[PDB]
Design a protein around this ligand. Structure first.
Ligand SMILES: CN(Cc1cnc2nc(N)nc(N)c2n1)c1ccc(C(=O)N[C@@H](CCC(=O)O)C(=O)O)cc1
Ligand SMILES: CN(Cc1cnc2nc(N)nc(N)c2n1)c1ccc(C(=O)N[C@@H](CCC(=O)O)C(=O)O)cc1
Ligand SMILES: [Cl-]
Ligand SMILES: [Cl-]
Lengths: 328, 328
């Protein structure tokens, strides 16, 4: 059984380039007992891979999740044709013993793409759900600031915020994303790349300030938002994508006098903190809200495993509208 | 009657200097009904004044709290001789209508100096109390890092943590402060100015990391501590004294990837958040611990109201062992 694999050939400096990756064709051993052979159907690329790749050694497989089908099975719990979520990395075929696999929701309907299991009704959507509902702790009526608002996490954060009864101000990197989020129902959406003054734009978007900040971006942008947080404002620190592809020193930290005077609470989190009953409940909620039309989705599907590095680089640079997914 | 007052002659640039302050003598009017004339007994100087002074206009009185005696009274709740806490700023005498005054605890004993009402058994001690017990939420058996650990706040934090069963690692700016806290029994104390490597020093002090960080200092020092926090570690942001006198940009912030991976919770606070029963209970706990010897105190008492700017500047430089107090 053959497989293709994208490995890290050279550690990224700034943004990745194509020569930092190397495609390798490898032979897989026959299935041992209890194992299954998985064929990737859809693979995801996500911002955290830029950071996690710094702990790889050159020659290692790029990390990542995929929706796959069992093509050969020596495990009766996972017969041939079963669809699963698996994280073997950027590889077309992989062998698993079944412990590290997740079946899709039992009521997953024919009407929603399986690829949403890597997005809105998968790990990005769960990140939004717990970051907003538990870390920010929205009760309804808050003004929420969300950046990278057209990504899979941010778009879910903003739409959950709307259905919980919040005002949502979203920052995105292109005019195409501005129009998209306005159609989704965000109260204010703006292109942070072209606005004359981020501080002025945020003050006009909410003269009263912000109760909650769902922060995917970090850096100088968050320093500006911090200066417009209300007293006891809550910040959920989900990512710092503005720093992942940085070439020099990190930007200044936030102004402590404002942080202290406003008694801000800032908590970072990773989606894996939540498991079991909480996590199954959240996936069911996300699926229900999608079916009810309260959460709309959009995917940027790139065809061909050979284009995974390019999909990752375009995703990191904000070139793609919707969740970037690679179709095998 | 007459009063002397220290005013802000010019906004501070960097550390305050002598030329930034101006002493003025003024005439107070007669007492209207319900008012009292107050004579300062002890005045405090504190780091927050470096920050709050930025909001003053030139010519304004410097802000701050004092222990005062009622020397003349037209208010039956405050007879002559009553000792109160009041915040008229840096002034020897003032008129108040009673609604902005605080009587000392009813049970205040003759064995502890009245000046402690501005320190260990006053706002600095309360800051330590709530910051540690409610913001860090220590339970017993944790490892706590506290900086400015020989200050009025830090020394209470470390000693409360000790009586709750925690390992305490303290950072201070002089060998005299190191020796004093080591005698008090803090598990590890070091002079952050002289260590060969702050990272190595913190590693040896707690190989497994820090559960709680009580932060008075901020800046680059806190970046190093954040890198050694345990998962779900809790930071109480009380002050950032290392930044208050800065003349240029703030240092970089912590590596965002470490904050996220360790899922840290960082919350800033000011003691005034707690009022009523919560504050009274805390003050009585602090008094009880002092009487029982579980909290030792130290004061640096400067004689003469004319020396208040010098006391303020010495305190900001860390030149004094013990809470800095001015005896009128
Ligand atoms: C699976 N997962 C949780 C998560 C978070 N941090 C990690 N960090 C590491 N080191 N390793 C992990 N496996 C990991 N996993 C995810 C996956 C995607 C996104 C995410 O932010 N995706 C983008 C994708 C954007 C796009 O496709 O354009 C988004 O904004 O939705 C977050 C968490
Ligand atoms: C009264 N109080 C609460 C507090 C805190 N921040 C404020 N900030 C502002 N702007 N305004 C206030 N009134 C204010 N009050 C205090 C007072 C002192 C310390 C403090 O940290 N004192 C020094 C004293 C050290 C010394 O005297 O040598 C220390 O670090 O221990 C903290 C809070
Ligand atoms: Cl963007
Ligand atoms: Cl110090």
């Amino acid at each position: 059984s053959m497989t293709k694999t994208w490995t890290l050939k050279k550690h990224f400096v700034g943004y990745p380039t194509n020569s930092d990756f190397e495609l390798k064709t490898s032979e897989l051993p026959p299935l041992k007992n209890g194992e299954v052979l998985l064929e990737a159907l859809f693979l995801t690329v996500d911002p955290y891979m830029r950071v996690a790749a710094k702990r790889l050694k050159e020659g290692d497989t790029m990390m990542g999740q995929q929706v796959a089908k069992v093509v050969e099975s020596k495990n009766v719990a996972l017969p041939k044709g079963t669809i699963v979520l698996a994280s073997p990395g950027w590889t077309t075929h992989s062998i698993s013993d079944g412990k590290d696999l997740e079946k899709l929701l039992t009521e997953w309907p024919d009407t929603i793409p399986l690829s949403l299991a890597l997005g809105t009704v998968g790990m990005p959507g769960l990140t939004a759900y717990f970051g907003l509902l538990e870390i920010c702790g929205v009760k309804g009526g808050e003004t929420v600031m969300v950046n990278a608002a057209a990504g899979a996490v941010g778009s879910v954060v903003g739409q959950i915020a709307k259905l919980k009864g919040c005002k949502v101000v979203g920052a995105v990197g292109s005019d195409e994303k501005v129009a998209y989020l306005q159609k989704l129902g965000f109260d204010v959406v703006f292109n942070y790349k072209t606005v004359e003054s981020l501080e002025e734009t945020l003050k006009k978007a909410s003269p009263d300030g912000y109760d909650c900040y769902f922060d995917n971006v970090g850096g100088e942008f968050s320093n500006t938002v911090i200066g417009q947080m209300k007293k006891f404002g809550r910040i959920a620190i989900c990512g710092a994508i503005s720093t992942y592809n940085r070439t020099g020193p990190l930007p200044p930290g936030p102004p402590p006098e404002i942080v202290i005077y406003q008694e801000l609470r800032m908590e970072a989190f990773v989606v894996y903190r939540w498991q079991g009953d909480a996590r199954q409940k959240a996936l069911k909620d996300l699926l229900k809200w999608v079916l009810e039309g309260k959460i709309q989705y959009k995917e940027y599907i790139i065809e061909g495993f050979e284009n995974m590095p390019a999909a990752f680089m375009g995703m990191l640079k904000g070139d793609n509208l919707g969740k970037t997914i690679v179709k095998a």
